[PDB]
Design a protein around this nucleic acid. Structure first.
Ligand SMILES: [Mg+2]
Lengths: 105, 678
DNA sequence: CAGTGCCTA
DNA sequence: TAGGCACTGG
């Protein structure tokens, strides 16, 4: 139950949503992105009701990533009340992420 | 006969000081050095060789040493010094004639490394001398804890410079004797290092005299320069830049930016197996970083990374209309299926393909024309203002562009142009061509005395290549082809032969035939590319036996695999031939090149005979010679009319001189600039 | 250094 | 436009 964003829906689905939202900026051609993908599927299920996991493919939606810099992928941005609260870059393990979230939530 | 060379403080354009000179006299077999205070004596020695009706040998003396000495004698000694053309020999000019199949660094202006094939040893050394001297100077300073300034090695005279000067003359003497050992150009029975100037020119192959005359005249043409409308080109630049931005703004809106991998330094390996994945972009694995930085709950680590968690570093990229890679990337993502690729494996995206490209999205389909226009405009801007060789970067203080010319840069005897290449200025038929061409004109030079604009005379040899073909065919058709050109319709005649639809296609066919174009280029003239390209040529020859006869006698001369690898040019010189198939074309192109060369030489000699003075302080000035046309600046309309008729006279003289079987003509046009005179 | 355009027919 | 010169991208 992951939210698949688009440039047009980003503002509303993320910057105006209620609660915390973890956005994953990725690309089909990134090895590290493909690694964390199945990890994101699991976190979405275990944190349902406590967190919203969203993904934005930067090739299909090239207008959003630039607004946050992004020098590497996968870039995981944790949003809260329409603002970036925490950020990590790279294919973290289910454990490091679980720790990252619990710690920031 | 003496061999010489000088060292001065700069290139011709800004030279102001004679540092030293060296003379080797064949009559005494001795080298004599002249230091700064011997300038006068050096000049006296040269003039004494002239008084004896002797010869002076320089390496590139026609373009540098001779004119620099005239300039320096006036500036430093208030003396009039003018070595006559008849008394000078140039080993560079001779090398380019005898070793025309080889390239050279054009005296160090070009990086030898980029040149194809081999280079003549002595010539190579001479062209590398300056850079070599600079490296020895740079070292001696770097060894004495002393700073070096870009070109300080040429500011003052010194013994190391003197030594290089002497070395120059020893190497030039060696080159000279090597060139003179070629029996094809110099009869073995004559010691050319022991004859007067009249005998040297009269007893050597005619090509030797022609090349020295061409080089002398073209050196004068370079010094003349081509009057240039700087202000107009600057306004053209503003206009082009504005259109460039606007085209960029539109295209960047249509095609947005994206991300691309960059900076990866580690192979991506399948976490499961460990299998290397070279295809996947490179990644980076952070060594430091954690969820909660190093130490009751710890403190959260504000860092973006986490040790061991890999990621692919990327950079943001904006659409660049000049990048063929970007264009290719954006169009395929639109539904374009690449039909032709390159050898290095990559989609071919020249203007041709961009025209055939079709995509569903209407806006992206229209953007292609914007891209085409952007590339063309980029081309015009680089050439006129931003390129390293831009026109606006070359305009000298006298308001003229002094482009360089290698008189015998092609093995056929054709000349080459560079710095900048004045033979590649956009034609009036091309976008912005009219403004480009109008910027080069005699009108942009105001007479030194009256302030009145000069006028331009543009003269072109008429259908020279075809006439050369007619000439060589006469041995077989007794002048029939030549007669048809002058008194008939050679094109419809060629159309009937080879059976073509439009007579204009006959022209397309013949002009491509003369310039040995592949069968492919032939097909594209009808619309059957490389297919009927073999049929057309064949059917043409069949109905024009004189041409087939010519091709055959030509190949019998070369192929026995080879009995001889060259054809004899009109002035007797050897002209290297790459393949038997190119023989005929080489023959025709060489005939055209040599006829035009002797023509421009005779034209100028006749003008001078008529009493007209060559120079801006005179009556006329050669500004440009581009293949079969010359553009001459004239002080008055009357003079321009004289130049035009004199050029016709000179051409007929050339046709008679070489017993040409086809009458030769020229066509002249008067006007203020190159746009109007073409 | 690869891919192209600009001149000359 | 075959031969040359020269430019911009990566
Ligand atoms: Mg010299």
């Amino acid at each position: 139950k992951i939210i698949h964003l688009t440039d047009d829906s980003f503002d509303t689905d993320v910057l105006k949503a209620d609660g915390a939202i973890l956005v994953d900026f990725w690309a089909e051609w990134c090895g590290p992105c493909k690694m964390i993908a199945p990890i994101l599927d699991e976190i979405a299920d275990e944190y349902q009701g406590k967190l919203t996991v969203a993904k934005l493919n930067i090739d299909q939606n090239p207008g959003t990533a630039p607004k946050y810099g992004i020098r590497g992928i996968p870039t995981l941005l944790l949003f809260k009340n329409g603002e970036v609260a925490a950020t990590k870059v790279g294919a973290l393990s289910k454990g490091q992420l679980k720790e990252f979230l619990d710690a920031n939530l | 006969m003496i061999v010489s060379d000088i060292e001065a403080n700069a290139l011709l354009e800004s030279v102001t000081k004679f540092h030293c000179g060296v003379i080797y006299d064949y009559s005494t077999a001795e080298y004599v050095s002249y230091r700064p205070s011997d300038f006068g004596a050096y000049l006296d020695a040269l003039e004494a060789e002239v008084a004896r009706g002797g010869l002076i040998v320089f390496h590139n003396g026609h373009k540098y040493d001779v004119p620099a000495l005239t300039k320096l004698a006036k500036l430093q000694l208030n003396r009039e010094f003018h070595l006559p053309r008849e008394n000078c020999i140039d080993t560079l000019v001779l090398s380019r004639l005898i070793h025309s199949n080889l390239k050279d660094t054009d005296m160090g202006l070009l990086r030898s490394g980029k040149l194809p094939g081999a280079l003549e040893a002595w010539g190579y050394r001479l062209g590398e001398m300056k850079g070599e001297y600079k490296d020895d100077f740079k070292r001696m300073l770097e060894e004495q804890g002393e700073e070096y300034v870009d070109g300080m090695e040429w500011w003052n005279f010194n013994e190391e410079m003197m030594d290089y000067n002497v070395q120059d003359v020893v190497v030039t003497k060696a080159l000279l004797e090597k060139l003179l050992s070629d029996k094809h150009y110099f009869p073995p029975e004559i010691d050319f290092t022991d004859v007067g100037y009249t005998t040297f020119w009269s007893e050597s192959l005619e090509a030797v005299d022609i090349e020295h005359r061409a080089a002398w005249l073209l050196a004068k043409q370079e010094r003349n320069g081509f009057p240039f409308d700087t202000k107009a080109i600057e306004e053209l630049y503003v206009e082009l830049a504005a259109r460039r931005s606007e085209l960029l703004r539109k295209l960047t809106e249509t095609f947005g930016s994206w991300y691309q991998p960059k900076g990866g330094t580690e192979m991506f390996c399948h976490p499961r197996t460990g299998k290397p994945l070279p295809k996947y972009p490179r990644i980076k694995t952070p060594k430091v970083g954690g969820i909660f930085k190093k130490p009751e709950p710890c403190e959260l680590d504000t860092r973006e990374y986490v040790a061991g968690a890999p990621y692919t570093p990327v950079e943001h990229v904006v659409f660049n209309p000049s990048s063929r890679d970007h264009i290719q990337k954006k169009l395929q993502e639109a539904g374009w299926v690449p039909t032709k690729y390159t050898d290095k494996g990559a989609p071919v995206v020249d203007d041709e393909v961009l025209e055939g490209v079709r995509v569903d999205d209407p806006e992206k389909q229209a953007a292609i024309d914007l891209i085409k226009e952007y590339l063309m405009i980029q081309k015009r801007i680089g050439q006129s203002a931003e390129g390293d060789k831009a026109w606006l970067r070359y305009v000298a203080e006298d308001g003229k562009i002094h482009g360089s010319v290698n008189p015998n840069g092609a093995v056929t005897g054709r000349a080459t142009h560079a710095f900048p290449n004045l033979a590649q200025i956009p034609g009036v038929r091309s976008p912005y061509g009219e403004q480009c061409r109008a910027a080069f004109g005699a009108e942009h030079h105001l007479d030194g005395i009256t302030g009145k604009p000069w006028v331009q005379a543009g003269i072109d040899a008429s259908g020279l290549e075809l006439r050369c073909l007619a000439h060589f065919m006469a041995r077989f058709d007794n002048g029939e082809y030549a007669h048809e050109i002058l008194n008939g319709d050679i094109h419809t005649k060629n159309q009937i032969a080879a059976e073509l639809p439009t007579r204009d296609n006959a022209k397309t066919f013949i002009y491509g035939f003369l310039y040995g174009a592949g069968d492919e280029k032939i097909g594209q003239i009808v619309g059957a590319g490389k297919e009927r390209g073999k049929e057309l040529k064949k059917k043409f020859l069949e109905n024009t036996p004189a041409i087939a006869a010519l091709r055959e006698s030509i190949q019998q001369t070369l192929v026995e695999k080879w009995k001889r690898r060259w054809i004899k040019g009109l002035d007797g010189r050897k002209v290297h031939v790459r393949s038997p198939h190119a023989a005929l074309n080489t023959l025709l192109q060489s005939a055209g090149a040599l006829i035009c060369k002797l023509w421009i030489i005779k034209t100028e000699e006749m003008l001078v005979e008529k009493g007209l003075k060559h120079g801006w302080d005179g009556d006329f000035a050669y500004m440009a010679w581009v293949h079969d046309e010359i553009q001459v600046g004239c002080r008055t309309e009357e003079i321009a009319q004289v130049v035009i008729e004199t050029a016709q006279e000179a051409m007929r003289w050339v046709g008679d001189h070489w017993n040409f079987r086809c009458l030769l003509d020229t066509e002249g046009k008067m006007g203020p600039n190159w746009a109007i005179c073409h």
